[PDB]
Design a protein around this ligand. Structure first.
Ligand SMILES: [Cl-]
Ligand SMILES: [Cl-]
Ligand SMILES: [Cl-]
Ligand SMILES: [Cl-]
Ligand SMILES: [Co+2]
Ligand SMILES: [Co+2]
Ligand SMILES: [Co+2]
Ligand SMILES: [Co+2]
Ligand SMILES: [Co+2]
Ligand SMILES: [Co+2]
Ligand SMILES: [Co+2]
Ligand SMILES: [Co+2]
Ligand SMILES: [Co+2]
Ligand SMILES: [Co+2]
Ligand SMILES: [Co+2]
Ligand SMILES: [Co+2]
Ligand SMILES: [Co+2]
Ligand SMILES: [Co+2]
Ligand SMILES: [Co+2]
Ligand SMILES: [Co+2]
Ligand SMILES: [Co+2]
Ligand SMILES: [Co+2]
Ligand SMILES: [Co+2]
Ligand SMILES: [Co+2]
Ligand SMILES: [Co+2]
Ligand SMILES: [Co+2]
Ligand SMILES: [Co+2]
Ligand SMILES: [Co+2]
Ligand SMILES: [Co+2]
Ligand SMILES: [Co+2]
Ligand SMILES: [Co+2]
Ligand SMILES: [Co+2]
Ligand SMILES: [Co+2]
Ligand SMILES: [Co+2]
Ligand SMILES: [Co+2]
Ligand SMILES: [Co+2]
Ligand SMILES: [Co+2]
Ligand SMILES: [Co+2]
Ligand SMILES: [Co+2]
Ligand SMILES: [Co+2]
Ligand SMILES: [Co+2]
Ligand SMILES: [Co+2]
Ligand SMILES: [Co+2]
Ligand SMILES: [Co+2]
Lengths: 104, 87, 100, 99, 99, 79, 106, 99
DNA sequence: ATCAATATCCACCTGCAGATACTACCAAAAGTGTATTTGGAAACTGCTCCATCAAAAGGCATGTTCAGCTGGATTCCAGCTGAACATGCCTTTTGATGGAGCAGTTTCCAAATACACTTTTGGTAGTATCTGCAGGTGGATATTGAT
DNA sequence: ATCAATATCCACCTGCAGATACTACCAAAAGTGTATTTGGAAACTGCTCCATCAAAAGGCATGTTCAGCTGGAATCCAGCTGAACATGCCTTTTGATGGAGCAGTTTCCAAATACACTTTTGGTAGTATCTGCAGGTGGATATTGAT
């Protein structure tokens, strides 16, 4: 019985407990901490795959590529802030042209 | 037999059409003639700084080969985190 | 198989893939996208583990507990992401402890 | 009766084209040579994983694109549409790459 | 028979006076009030160490002083000598606070 | 009120130290909102440090730690 | 105790403390004997660098005691110290006298 | 009186020592010394944290002076890096060569 | 230029906030002496991937020029809007004093680490076999700039 | 306003790069149990410093006048964009090749940990002395703005 199944999680509690020890963050790592962290991490993955899947769909694609991840993140105020100092390779920018630059 | 050719003036391989394309992606409509040399100047500083840290990491590992991880660590420590190349 | 045995390079890909199937059952992911996704989870893992690390220190605690992760999540994430992540993680710890 | 688009029409068209794609916009070899040159002035006899160089390109083109956005925004503040060296310098000063 | 200084003479005089000193320039109590009022929405019945409020004021005035520095640069970029909301807004956008 | 207790002459003094000569009328209100957002961001984080410590009093150190993580490190209160 | 590790290193800065703090700090499983020495030396040096220039600053303003104003002048007037402390605020330090030329009389 | 003492340690006495070596006729306010204590703690944490990372990138369980030295090179600007590197090797030598 | 008004400078002064100085006591920090444990440098070497060249196109995209349009730089000008200015008063500062709560101390147990079989699994390796989509296609709509 | 010279659109084609689908084996990871240790929650206390309000202090809200800065308008022209025109030694792409150097493995020893014991010490805490400079003055001199 994995601690993953036991917490209702697809992400690996055994690995996250492990990576927390290996990384010298504190002297002791409590039993709930890796459970809570694997949940947060899965929550956030699920959130970004949702938005990215949609972006895939909006462009008639069934395969998520980096463009989709980028549209997902940059179009979402919160993921955009959280990843405001990150660069997604092969993601491009958002189509945006400043008003004054259009003719009249 | 040993090749090794001299590398110089390679900043001018950053052509005027390539700078124009980057300006387009960045949404720029009109470009003054002095932009191209300004941009090359700016790129060189950028590259100098990342390569420096990147190569510092390489040397620390006692390697002669600059890995994608050296760049990624170097970029990360300058607050320009990159996804797509590992670690 | 096996060439002097290459040391194993572990990632989150099979788990990112499970979760992908849950939300978009007919959608796939390129290896490049899976690479961005694996970078993202590793990234966020480090940012939270380090706010946790710091917190513990600031309070003379030698243990990172779920209570350290929780505050780290509230420091790190914005608005709705923090609220939703806190409840999913609380959920998982409640469910985990009531099971023996 | 030969045909001519007016100044600005192909520019706007090019913006749409390039905002729409994700392909790297500097050619690979020229860029690789510039990396090898700059790195060689820091330390001789260096080799590069091909993806160390692609990482530097991705990072470099992303930094440059973002800077022109800021730069464009400084031109427009000055009631212009032409990016000038002094717009870049203002961008970089506020950004803290100068002060 | 009365005596008047030209517009700008006293402004310059103040710039010189205030750049020379280091004293906090917002009065303490209004600041303490505003701090507590903002804090109250995150948690009720809070007390504040007095050094907690001094640190918030130090940090806040340092931020606003430096932001007026960038704002002034943005005004000057647009060939003005009067700071406006658009200048503060340009600064914060390029600083990555609005971005 | 409160935000309005951050007076026009106080905002003008900050501008002066910032090297500012002439000031648009609309600036004082713009300066206030900017300051509000600044204190909201830092205090939020400081109070999250207080709650963790199971205290009812915001300490200088809660503030200093919040400022550090906003990338606005401050020297002089790290006792 | 024979000699402190500081005097063995020629240092005013506490090698024992720095060593202890590198352990208590969760930076690695282990800490070699030389690292606390190296780091204490680096810390002392940068201290000396800042006190030097802020000492100079005090003199220039006809004073014998270093106040935070002097540390601010010292640091901001030095290109390298100013870069190292580019995201730092020195409390009660103020600013450098600087007025944009376009704002100057007539 | 071992009660209300929970020992708060600081660099203040070691900073004061170095003051006298460089400026024997010069004093320092409490505020300014508090700032200097912050400087050392900050710089300590930055250097210590960068070495931690280096040791980790390279699968090493130990922070040696080599990690401190690379951390200094990565962290300090040009000339400051040079002398600090020179000071630290100097102190290690003096320490290794000591009876 | 004239020159009155007022800001600014410097010297000398003095009182006191805060800096020094010295003695004292005390935990904990720090060094010294001694078994024992192990990270990781050193030597050997498999085997991945980097540098290099050949040699074409898969010829793309660039550099150079020359035209001429129109955005930028200049100039002037009106009126609008912020700078200067003056002082009672109404708010902030400064000092005074309970009592909240932070910080100190001690108690004990739920959950931490150690650690040994036993079980489970993700990574990889290696071929084996689908499929989404780039890239080419026509060919039926959309925009632009000259009238 | 029409419309012709072009760019753009979107859906339906193909060949293949790259993605998912096998089954294998296995070292490492993860679960389970047991033996032993301890971090920090919890309950209690005292005194430190925080909120409150004594009055004593002084910065600023107010309106009015107008200097001068800012935006609007008009002009001019050069520096920019669009496009033709010749052609990379120029980039891309393909593909093979040798071989540097990274990374797997084993050995083994210097230096780390661990721990016990001695002694040294920095932080805290009164108690006393003492001094740098802030903020007072006076008298000189420079700056500014109306002539
Ligand atoms: Cl826990
Ligand atoms: Cl320019
Ligand atoms: Cl505005
Ligand atoms: Cl060492
Ligand atoms: Co959202
Ligand atoms: Co600490
Ligand atoms: Co919600
Ligand atoms: Co060279
Ligand atoms: Co790592
Ligand atoms: Co030197
Ligand atoms: Co006279
Ligand atoms: Co004089
Ligand atoms: Co006296
Ligand atoms: Co006193
Ligand atoms: Co070993
Ligand atoms: Co012409
Ligand atoms: Co025009
Ligand atoms: Co104009
Ligand atoms: Co007029
Ligand atoms: Co008005
Ligand atoms: Co009392
Ligand atoms: Co009392
Ligand atoms: Co109580
Ligand atoms: Co408490
Ligand atoms: Co109890
Ligand atoms: Co399996
Ligand atoms: Co495979
Ligand atoms: Co297509
Ligand atoms: Co066609
Ligand atoms: Co048209
Ligand atoms: Co159609
Ligand atoms: Co294939
Ligand atoms: Co205990
Ligand atoms: Co006028
Ligand atoms: Co104007
Ligand atoms: Co080969
Ligand atoms: Co070899
Ligand atoms: Co190796
Ligand atoms: Co002592
Ligand atoms: Co005296
Ligand atoms: Co005296
Ligand atoms: Co004075
Ligand atoms: Co006088
Ligand atoms: Co006087």
């Amino acid at each position: 019985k994995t601690r993953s199944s036991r917490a209702g999680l697809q992400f690996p509690v055994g690995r996250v407990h492990r990576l927390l020890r290996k990384g010298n963050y504190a002297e002791r790592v409590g039993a709930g901490a890796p459970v809570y962290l694997a949940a947060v991490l899965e929550y956030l993955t699920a959130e970004i795959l949702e938005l990215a899947g949609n972006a895939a769909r909006d462009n008639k694609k069934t395969r998520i590529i980096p463009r989709h991840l980028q549209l997902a993140v940059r179009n979402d105020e919160e993921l955009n802030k959280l990843l405001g100092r990150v660069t997604i390779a092969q993601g491009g920018v958002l189509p945006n042209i400043q008003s004054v630059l259009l003719p009249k | 037999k040993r090749h090794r050719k001299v590398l110089r003036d390679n900043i001018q391989g950053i052509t005027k059409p390539a700078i124009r394309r980057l300006a387009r992606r960045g949404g720029v409509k009109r470009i003054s003639g002095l932009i191209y040399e300004e941009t090359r100047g700016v790129l060189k500083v950028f590259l100098e700084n990342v390569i420096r840290d990147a190569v510092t990491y390489t040397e620390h590992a006692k390697r002669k080969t600059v890995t994608a991880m050296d760049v990624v660590y170097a970029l990360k420590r300058q607050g320009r985190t990159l996804y797509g190349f590992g670690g | 198989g096996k060439k002097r045995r290459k040391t194993r390079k572990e990632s989150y890909a099979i788990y990112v893939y499970k979760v992908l199937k849950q939300v978009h059952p007919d959608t796939g992911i390129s290896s490049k996208a899976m690479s961005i996704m694996n970078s993202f989870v590793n990234d966020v893992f480090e940012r939270i583990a380090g706010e946790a690390s710091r917190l513990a220190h600031y309070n003379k605690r030698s243990t990172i507990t779920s209570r350290e992760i929780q505050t780290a999540v509230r420091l790190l994430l914005p608005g709705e992401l923090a609220k939703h992540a806190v409840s999913e993680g609380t959920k998982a710890v409640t469910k985990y402890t009531s099971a023996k | 009766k030969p045909h001519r688009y007016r100044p600005g029409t192909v520019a706007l068209r090019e913006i749409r084209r390039y905002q729409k794609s994700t392909e790297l916009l500097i050619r690979k070899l020229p860029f690789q040579r510039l990396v090898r040159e700059i790195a060689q002035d820091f330390k001789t006899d260096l080799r590069f994983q091909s993806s160390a160089v692609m990482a530097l390109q991705e990072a470099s083109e992303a930094y440059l694109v973002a800077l022109f956005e800021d730069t464009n925004l400084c031109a427009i503040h000055a009631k212009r549409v032409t990016i000038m060296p002094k717009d870049i310098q203002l961008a970089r000063r506020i950004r803290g790459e100068r002060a």
